[PDB]
């Protein structure tokens, strides 16, 4: 019976081709009767100006609602009839459009994706309908205290930069984005070198390449053309936003230091460290017995309804830290214990806990990459960020390298004596003063 090490080698190579386009076409072949296919674009709210902001999200609302070849509901009718699922997302950096379909339906799935991405109708009556839909989604998003603190964290950490902006944009932008604003976004951004066609499942690469040459030919093949920007770097600011609202039953706090980018090798050791602090929720088994000292004390002393570590990555910057949800009389204790764990790891990470952090990452990575959909997303996103698919054996080698010395050096670089960004929403009177948060970022005994 095979080892873990052997099993990672047995995971098949991601095949990559490039079209004359500049459009990258990439696949992981498996045995499965089903597939995920999609288009990953280097486009999001980081690319948008104050006037443009929310355009990509507006395009997401229109993308499935009619093309030049299939008008109105005709695309919907085709996806549904084959038993396929059609989905989209927009982050700050990345837009994606993907189909879960039967493997035998890969030709029509690629055909439809090309039709969405190139030949979107943007019928003026549809743009008007979507205006009211987006506004209601803003009213909805407002009730999600998690979504609000993370928007606030971005808005304070990245302040004067395009990373400060939400994906969905302000309400005034929603009400005054014209067809011409959107056409200009699609013209500037939906260009073949900036887009990747990804697939995972029961397909040959050759077949995917052939369909890429059939349906994605002549996006850029005489054009590309003048005025692009590359992404300007986004200044991080040590800062605090405090939305005091005592009507709300629980406080939300998010706290982050400046992460490095996507590209940077010490993301791996930061993730080892974040796994050691872990996550918690009030529905976990194990109060007292949980390995993480934050999780254990939060459960024992009832400090918490939930917490999570995060390492959000953008190009050349990030948000590294933690979010938590607690009672009004528990914020000060939660912060003290959170910061003490950062300080403990910076100064005095031991070996046993680092191994636990390593194993948790190994399990997380393999558990995540399970299904055509998460593997497809991983192909599309990786080729945008890294340029290659980084194979599971490489990640393993990168995880294995991390020991206690690596945890303590890498944590010190990002956490130790650094200005955090803080976002607070809700009954937040007991939220520590920023100076006293700042003072938690170093230890006087060290």
């Amino acid at each position: 019976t095979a080892t873990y090490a052997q099993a990672l080698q047995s995971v098949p190579e991601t095949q990559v081709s490039q079209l004359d386009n500049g459009l990258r076409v990439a696949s992981e072949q498996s045995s499965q009767p089903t597939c995920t296919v999609g288009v990953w674009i280097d486009a999001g709210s980081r690319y948008e100006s104050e006037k443009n902001n929310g355009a990509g999200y507006f395009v997401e609302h229109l993308a499935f609602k009619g093309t030049k070849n299939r008008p109105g509901n005709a695309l919907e009718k085709e996806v549904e009839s084959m038993g396929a699922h059609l989905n989209a997302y927009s982050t700050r950096e990345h837009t994606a459009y993907y189909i879960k379909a039967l493997s035998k339906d890969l030709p029509k799935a690629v055909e439809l994706l090309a039709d969405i991405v190139q030949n979107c109708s943007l019928e003026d009556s549809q743009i008007e309908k979507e205006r009211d839909v987006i506004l209601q989604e803003l009213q909805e998003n407002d009730t999600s205290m998690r979504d609000v603190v993370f928007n606030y964290l971005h808005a304070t950490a990245f302040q004067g930069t395009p990373l400060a902006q939400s994906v969905e944009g302000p309400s005034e932008n929603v009400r005054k984005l014209s067809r011409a604003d959107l056409t200009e976004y699609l013209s500037r951004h939906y260009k073949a070198p900036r887009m990747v066609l990804a697939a995972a499942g029961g397909l040959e690469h050759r077949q995917l390449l052939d369909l890429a040459q059939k349906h994605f030919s002549g996006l850029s093949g005489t054009y590309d053309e003048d005025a692009v920007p590359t992404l300007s770097p986004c200044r991080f600011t040590g800062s605090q936003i405090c939305h005091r609202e005592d009507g709300l039953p629980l406080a939300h706090v998010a706290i982050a230091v400046e992460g490095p980018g996507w590209a940077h090798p010490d993301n791996v050791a930061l993730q080892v460290a974040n796994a050691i602090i872990g996550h918690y929720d009030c529905t976990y088994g194990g109060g007292a017995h949980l390995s993480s000292p934050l999780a254990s004390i939060a459960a024992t002393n009832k400090l918490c309804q939930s917490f999570q570590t995060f390492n959000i990555c953008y190009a050349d910057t990030g948000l590294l830290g933690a979010h938590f949800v607690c009672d009004h009389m528990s914020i000060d204790d939660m912060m003290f214990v959170l910061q003490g764990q950062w300080m403990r790891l910076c100064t005095s990470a031991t070996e046993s806990e680092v191994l636990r952090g390593k194993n948790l990452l190994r399990n997380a990575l393999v558990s995540h990459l399970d299904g055509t959909t998460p593997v497809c997303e991983d192909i599309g996103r990786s080729l945008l960020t890294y340029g290659r698919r980084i194979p599971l054996a490489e990640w393993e080698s990168r995880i294995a390298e991390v020991d206690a010395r690596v945890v303590r050096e890498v944590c010190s670089k990002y956490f130790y004596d650094q200005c955090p960004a803080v976002a607070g929403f809700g009954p937040i009177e007991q939220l520590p003063d920023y100076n006293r948060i700042r003072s938690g970022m170093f230890w006087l005994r060290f």
Binding site: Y416, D417, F442, W443, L444, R445, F446
Partner: protein, 60 residues
Amino acid sequence: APTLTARLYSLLFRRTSTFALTIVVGALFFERAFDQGADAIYEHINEGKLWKHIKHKYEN
């Protein structure tokens, strides 16, 4: 081409241990340099102290 404030931070201020070590080494060297100057300023202002005492000593 990195700054001297940046170097004084990196080498000395980051650890509270070295920060405290800087101040105490700093205080000993400061006590010498401050007293030596503050005597010499007071000495230059005055000149009827035991500036005179060449007169009365060494005869002994």
